[PDB]
Structure 1
């Protein structure tokens, strides 16, 4: 079979030869008890850079030793790219949400061999699902592979905004001391109201990590969590996002982007927020009106905004969120720590083994069953 794998470029100073550490923590399951990926083997050392071009998700030896073709490229955009040229006869396409190779109706129609669209990562925002369905293309994701990674990024970001860490660090880095300039915008998180929009794998992991900070936890979602969960975390439920915002010191967005959630954070909804609110958004950039957030921070409606997600993406050089005051942004990276990569490289391989060997692919992985078993 032909496998077409899109990955992001190596580091600008080359693919690493050494790493900061020698191994990764051992984990057997995800919270709720979903098992970590189970491929028959892996051909990498966990902790290696796998999601960049030279890493190849550690797939090459496995696929080639099995008679397959693997083409890896970062060149994915527009009709002349290596991706689109190689797509025409690829059986399997793989990319990460961090460098997604979009499978539009057009591209799918051109993909005459396409049997599987694998997300090395979580989700399928880059794949046209109806089109996949109309061609019996299996769409699979490595469910849960980086839900925890993102939740940690979220909590890191919340603390850092509230405590004014990034300007404080700049004072240090630049030869300053300047205690008052550091702390005239710095608070403790303790006993603030923090709310999450959605309590899925990410948002729940976030809530659990926030709890011993002694914050008041709020959430809203399509449906409530079990009562036992709401009770162990002392959660306050809100039927709507709009109901939740006004009481929150911090709001974190851990929800899907939909027609209906687009620009859900905009100039008018931002008035529902408490003055000096903080927003963390590792969900989707377009959940927020880009200039509406920039305005709220110039105004002081918001005392902080952070995330790793942007519109559009990659963020152009001049995106206002790079430089707006009290921002704590990163490029789109939370679910691509080396740790997460090791998991999703393993699950990507697990899925391909099942797919090629005619074994069922985990139900939790399947978004669209094509001609795969489940």
Structure 2
């Protein structure tokens, strides 16, 4: 069998020979009890670069040792590329959302042998779920593997927007001081109203982290959390996005991309937010209308916007989120920290082992299986 694995390029300075620290903390389990991934073995040391071409997610010796062939490449765009050329032979396709091999219906129609599409990470919107259901393709992702990582990125970006971190760092590099230029748009987060769209693995983790900042917490999702959980964190639930955003100084989006959330934050919804509200989006790019975000930033309806997710990915050189005012963007990185890579690489291997040993894949990893949304997919997604 042939496994088709798309990963991002090595660093332009070469694949690293050393690292800033000697190791990473050992993460045994996640909040709520889900165990860390359980592959029989890992062919890497946590802390190493696994998500790039040279890292191979630590998969080669395990796969080739079973008699399979593994194609690793970063070349994912075009019909004469390595990905789309190898696709008709692939039984298994793997890729990361940070450098996603888009599985369109046209590409799935060509992938005659494809049975398993693995998201090395969290979030399978780059796969056409409707077409995968149609063709009997199983879709899995490493649920929870980088949820905590993203929640850290969120609190970081909220604080950077509100406190005006990045323009202030820029005065340091320009040789200035310019206190009044830094702080004429610098506020404390303390006692602001913060609301999250979704209170799942990331959302709940953001709410727990936000709590000791003494903010007023808000959340909107289709199903409420346990009342006991709400009272312990001081949460107000809202039946609609609209009802939540109208009283929020800061909004975080932590929902998956599916028809319920596509183009959710458009001109209309953003106009219902508070004047000068801050918007953070580490979820998926297309949940916010690209031009509606730019446009509320230029007017001041949004005081700032930040996130790591774009559409498409990679973002083109002229993508307007690069140049819109008052942003604190990164490329899609929060879920591919070295710490997180250790977890979703182990989880990717666990899924493969389950596939090739004809053991069932963890129910929480599943998105679609047997021609339907299944597992976490039926809980979090819509088609």
Q: CA deviation at 1:98?
A: 0.9
Deviation per CA, 1:282-318, whole angstroms, max 9, x where unpaired? 1121222222222222221111110011223222212
Q: CA deviation at 1:262?
A: 2.7
TM-score with structure 1 setting the length? 0.96
- Is the Cα contact below 8 Å between 2:100 and 2:313 reproduced in 1? no
> Which residue does the alignment assign to 2:378?
none
Q: CA deviation at 1:37?
A: 0.5
Are 1:103 and 2:137 counterparts?
no
Q: Aligned runs of 1:1-374 on 2, under 5 Å?
A: 1-370=1-370
Q: CA deviation at 1:91?
A: 1.4
Q: CA deviation at 1:260?
A: 4.2
- Is the Cα contact below 8 Å between 1:196 and 1:251 reproduced in 2? yes
Tell me the distance in 1 between the aligned counterparts of 2:53 and 2:282: 24
Farther off after superposition, 178-187 or 263-272: 263-272
TM-score with structure 2 setting the length? 0.94
Deviation per CA, 1:62-120, whole angstroms, max 9, x where unpaired? 11122110110111112211111111111111111111112222222222222211110
Alpha-carbon spacing, 1:271–1:110, altered in 2? closer, same or farther (3 Å): closer
Deviation per CA, 1:210-253, whole angstroms, max 9, x where unpaired? 00000000011001110011000100111111011111110011
Tell me the distance in 2 between the aligned counterparts of 1:12 and 1:149: 24
Farther off after superposition, 300-309 or 310-319: 310-319
- Is the Cα contact below 8 Å between 2:98 and 2:336 reproduced in 1? yes
Task: Return 5+ residue gaps in structure 2 as ranges.
Answer: 376-383
Tell me the distance in 1 between the aligned counterparts of 2:155 and 2:328: 12
SS at match of 2:279: strand
SS at match of 1:316: coil
SS at match of 1:291: helix
Tell me the distance in 1 between the aligned counterparts of 2:112 and 2:76: 18
Farther off after superposition, 70-79 or 152-161: 70-79
- Is the Cα contact below 8 Å between 1:190 and 1:213 reproduced in 2? yes
> Which residue does the alignment assign to 2:381?
none
SS at match of 1:335: helix
How much is the aligned-residue C-alpha RMSD, in angstroms?
A: 1.5
Tell me the distance in 1 between the aligned counterparts of 2:361 and 2:289: 38
Tell me the distance in 1 between the aligned counterparts of 2:370 and 2:72: 24
- Is the Cα contact below 8 Å between 1:195 and 1:217 reproduced in 2? yes
Tell me the distance in 1 between the aligned counterparts of 2:351 and 2:261: 31
Tell me the distance in 2 between the aligned counterparts of 1:134 and 1:223: 28
- Is the Cα contact below 8 Å between 2:87 and 2:111 reproduced in 1? yes
- Is the Cα contact below 8 Å between 2:125 and 2:258 reproduced in 1? no
Tell me the distance in 2 between the aligned counterparts of 1:285 and 1:362: 28
Task: Return 5+ residue gaps in structure 1 as ranges.
Answer: none
- Is the Cα contact below 8 Å between 1:120 and 1:142 reproduced in 2? yes
> Which residue does the alignment assign to 2:379?
none
Alpha-carbon spacing, 1:292–1:353, altered in 2? closer, same or farther (3 Å): same
Deviation per CA, 1:13-53, whole angstroms, max 9, x where unpaired? 11111111111111111111100001000011111111111
SS at match of 2:158: helix
Tell me the distance in 2 between the aligned counterparts of 1:259 and 1:359: 32
